[PDB]
Design a protein around this nucleic acid. Structure first.
Lengths: 56, 110, 46, 120
RNA sequence: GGUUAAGCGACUAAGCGUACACGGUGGAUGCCCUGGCAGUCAGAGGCGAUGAAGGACGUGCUAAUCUGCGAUAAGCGUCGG
RNA sequence: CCCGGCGAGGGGAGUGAAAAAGAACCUGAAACCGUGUACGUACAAGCAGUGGGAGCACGCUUAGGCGUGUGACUGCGUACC
RNA sequence: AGGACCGAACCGACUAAUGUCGAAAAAUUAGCGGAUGACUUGUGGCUGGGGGUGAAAGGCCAAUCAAACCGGGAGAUAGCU
RNA sequence: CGAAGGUGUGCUGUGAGGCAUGCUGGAGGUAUCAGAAGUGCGAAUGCUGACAUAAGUAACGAUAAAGCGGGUGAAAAGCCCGCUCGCCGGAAGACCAAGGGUUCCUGUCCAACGUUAAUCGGGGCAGGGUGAGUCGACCCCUAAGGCGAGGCCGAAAGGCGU
RNA sequence: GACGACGUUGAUAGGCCGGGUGUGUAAGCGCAGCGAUGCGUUGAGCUAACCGGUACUAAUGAACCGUGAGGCUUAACCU
């Protein structure tokens, strides 16, 4: 539970070698509405494969 | 022509804003707005509210061009601390320091 | 737990009050040192 | 170790779990759409689809059966009285799940459950 | 010029190291004074029942606190500058 | 004036000798923290330096080669009080 | 009638758990001992450091007690780090 | 037409150091030779201020419990309403004394506080509200008990007491 | 985190019809009983994850990283 001899800022870096946020670059474009949602999701205006699905 | 926008004293820590403002290093703006609109975090609330304020400083003060407009440098740097006192058990306290951070967004056409 | 300061103003007044501490000569020196050490609140007042 | 089990626990005791899925399924058919998280959306489906299954072949006894499982006759009033000819032909599924997005409250995978036949 | 094999063989860098350029936090150094200590020189060497030292509560154009003052309350009269 | 939540914060403009003097305000070191460029680095172990040293990268002279950065690999080497 | 029995309140702390950088500088869940007495609680007083008080443990005297705490002797003294 | 200080740089001395100079800096510095000391720091589990590390780990404070729709709004698991669900009920209900002293309420705001966000709050800004011949005290009467005119007693204070 | 099965050229999941399984004579009517209840309907009814099928819903066109015949020298075979 304790540290006896403080690790350098070197090894503090290499522990942070894998924290990097996964990119969500894979956007989609609508079939018959042309707008952009996230893939397998709905827009801000209720479109999903060219349908007013939620009408909100 | 070059322009810079800064949010000073953003109420978080440096590694919390370093992680999403690592992806938008070396990007164009419209792919950066689209990688920050759908990153599910709090720093993506922070700097995406400021990264759009940087392109405002282009279209208004510097180069109105936004289509082919790059982001050159972005580096979140530390700020002050709100050193409150946290109570730990058995009578002893604990000097908490609520962290605070500064972010620059630098926008130009290299 | 039953912590030590279970307070009052009736215990407080007749012990550490003005006329209590400015009764005897050994009390009076405290009122004549809190003066000279320049304290605002002399002993207890509301 | 879960190997070939089913019915996710959703981090509540069984008594709490069953009583929520009542008052979501009561809430589901009254407003016809709900926003929930992804698993509750994914597992309100496995609970509600019995109801409109056991309400096409209308009987006297199945009224209490959708009252022993519901204890809400106003929801039972919408069943058997509109839902009958609404679902004669759908041999099977009645829910088109929609993946909406992300809860700005606490980063949940939000979603949308509906009955299929929608015109309002 | 092409072909099989044999030997040898960089640029890759998730991060990390070092030097420079860049700030970031930080508030040390130099500089500054109506702050304070030690004394020289005279003067005083007391205030107090024709109500003290030290306080409470009020007073203005005012919300507050400090200074002053006290139902005549940031002030009255009086003789001067 | 633009952007923002008619927030915070910030970029221009104007004052001013200067806003890398802006109310957290003269000067602003070090620890610590990042940005960029250059080099080394994923078969090598060990007080992390020193002696030697290829290549690469640069300021240059004067084109013969020094200076600075890094430093593969190698010889020794078990911190201070 | 009972310093009588059973058992809540109230009280006390027996056993185990948990906790023991605690939710707490002595607790929480499961039980346990009593429960009209030599009991329990509230409020207002009295006693005082070689002194109080004690169904006596050197226990208690503001989480500290084989002599409390504050200031003053006093910058004690230290052949000792 | 640039003092000290800071920050690099080329030179220089056997070392402690010195001298010249680029940038930053914006008003003070001090030769030669001598005089006096709060005169040179790595340690003392030294003091003080600041910043690392463990670590983005642990934990979020009782294992009474949520779920949905609507609205306000820039953004809503937590705020306001409605609809059910679940928990307390010799209490986790409602009044009072103690003790706290605006903590109650409307408008408004989210920097900070609330172990999170927050339009909400016992948070900040502003205003408002507490109305008694009978309720409690003050007031008339004593207990335990404290002072204590004369007095007794004691180096002095002061102790006991009518 | 990996490995595996599918993504409308679809049985990968949920639903659904049936079967299987488990519990036992559902409810509601009528009869017998002043009544509790017993009988008939009725080995009915209800049935988590099990097995066999059915696309009813959910598993989209893309977008994306990954490229553009693969260095030096010698030998042995192509001519």
């Amino acid at each position: 539970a304790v540290q006896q001899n403080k690790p350098t800022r070197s090894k503090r870096g290499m522990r942070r070698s894998h924290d990097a946020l996964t990119a969500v670059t894979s956007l989609s474009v609508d079939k018959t509405s042309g707008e952009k949602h996230l893939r397998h999701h709905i827009t801000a205006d209720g479109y999903y494969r060219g349908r007013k699905v939620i009408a909100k | 022509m070059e322009t810079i926008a800064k949010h000073r004293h953003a109420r978080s820590s440096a590694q919390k804003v370093r992680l999403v403002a690592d992806l938008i290093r070396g990007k164009k703006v419209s792919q950066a707005l689209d990688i920050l609109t759908y990153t599910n975090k709090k720093a993506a609330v922070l700097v995406k509210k400021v990264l759009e304020s940087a392109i405002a400083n282009a279209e208004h003060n510097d180069g109105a061009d936004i289509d082919d407009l790059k982001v050159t440098k972005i580096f979140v740097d530390e700020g002050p601390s709100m050193k409150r006192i946290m109570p730990r058990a058995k009578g002893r306290a604990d000097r908490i320091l609520k962290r605070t951070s500064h972010i620059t967004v630098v926008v130009s056409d290299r | 737990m039953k912590r030590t300061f279970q307070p009052s103003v009736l215990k407080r007044n007749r012990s550490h009050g003005f006329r209590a501490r400015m009764a005897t000569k050994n009390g009076r020196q405290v009122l004549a040192r809190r003066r000279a050490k320049g304290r605002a609140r002399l002993t207890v007042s509301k | 170790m879960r190997h070939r089990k089913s019915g996710r626990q959703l981090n509540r005791n069984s008594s709490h779990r069953q009583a929520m899925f009542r008052n979501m399924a009561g809430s589901l058919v009254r407003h016809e759409i709900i926003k929930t998280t992804l698993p509750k959306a994914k597992e309100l489906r496995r609970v509600v689809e019995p109801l409109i299954t056991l309400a096409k072949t209308d009987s006297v006894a199945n009224r209490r059966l959708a009252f022993a499982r519901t204890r809400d006759n106003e929801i039972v009033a919408k069943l058997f009285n509109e839902l009958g000819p609404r679902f004669a032909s759908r041999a099977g599924g009645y829910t088109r799940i929609l993946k909406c997005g992300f809860r700005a409250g606490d980063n949940a995978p939000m979603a949308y459950i509906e009955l299929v036949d929608r015109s309002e």
